């Protein structure tokens, strides 16, 4: 039932489910990070990404993920969904994307 795309509430890192393994992977940083941050939030039902940043596995940790997914930047702007332009990769730099999507659907009373 969990949605395949998730964002961490600890550090906003994006996690994408890998169904052949049953694991969650990070999204390797790319020159198209803004469009990927924007698309990921939309995908999840948020309106937009307010900002995004790049984390480093060596300073931020893996936080229970197993690997990376890299985006096909050449197909990226033809899509509506993230899962169809992603592929496992090595992500040598170990830098991944964090996206701050606009918060919604929660009451803020005491």
């Amino acid at each position: 039932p969990l949605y395949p795309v998730q964002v961490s509430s600890a550090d906003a890192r994006l996690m994408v489910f890998d169904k052949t393994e049953g694991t969650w992977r990070l999204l390797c940083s790319s020159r198209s990070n803004a469009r990927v941050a924007g698309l990921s939030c939309e995908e999840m039902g948020f309106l937009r990404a307010l900002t995004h940043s790049e984390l480093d596995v060596r300073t931020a940790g893996a936080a229970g993920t197993s690997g990376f997914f890299c985006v096909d930047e050449g197909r990226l702007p033809h899509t509506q969904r993230l899962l169809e332009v992603i592929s496992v990769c090595d992500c040598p730099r170990g830098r991944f994307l964090a996206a701050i999507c606009q918060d919604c659907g929660r009451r803020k009373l005491p």
């Binding site: 998730q6 964002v7 995908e43 309106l47 919604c104």
Partner: protein, 248 residues
Amino acid sequence: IVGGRDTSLGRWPWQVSLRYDGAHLCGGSLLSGDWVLTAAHCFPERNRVLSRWRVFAGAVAQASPHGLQLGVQAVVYHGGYLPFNSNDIALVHLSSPLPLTEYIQPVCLPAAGQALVDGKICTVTGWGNTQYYGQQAGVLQEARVPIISNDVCNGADFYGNQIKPKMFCAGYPEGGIDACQGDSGGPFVCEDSISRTPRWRLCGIVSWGTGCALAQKPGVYTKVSDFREWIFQAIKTHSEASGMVTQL
């Protein structure tokens, strides 16, 4: 809303009231501090002078002096809304954004692929009439109603083939609890934990129905999932528009 109850401040923080020359005409849902999602039918020929519309937020009593009121810069409505009933949706851009507080918060959209769950019980809110031949509610009302399948709703005894693929019905076969006149444009929200956190998402927009709370004449809503892309495009395309614009 017929058969509902008075709700309190902060419970449904995305609910807003759209007033034209002082009167509450439609309900709406905040998508961000400056964008509201409502129904296209709330803007007929006669009500398109944006300076005469105001958006009232952050209060459940229509006469609260503590709610905020902002103006409208533009209205983007669906160009497939043939009355100008499918495609009864529109976006309203406020001239300035509302602050988000414990009483003003946006609601989420369904995720990509997220489908409606027939039988699931969601909430509908608004200041509409509490009886068809009644008066609007002074305090915002809330009611819980289940999603009905289209097979049932399109049956000759309900709406005999009038429910088209981008709308759905919600209510009780028995009637008694329903949305009503003055709730048009408002929210039909369902809660889920697919983002690992319980969040309320806008699954429908109060659109129409025959009478209110009659048995076998449930309320009909615009199915928001089917317009996700229309919403993302409209906001990218028209963020700087002023006036009435149409997007297909």
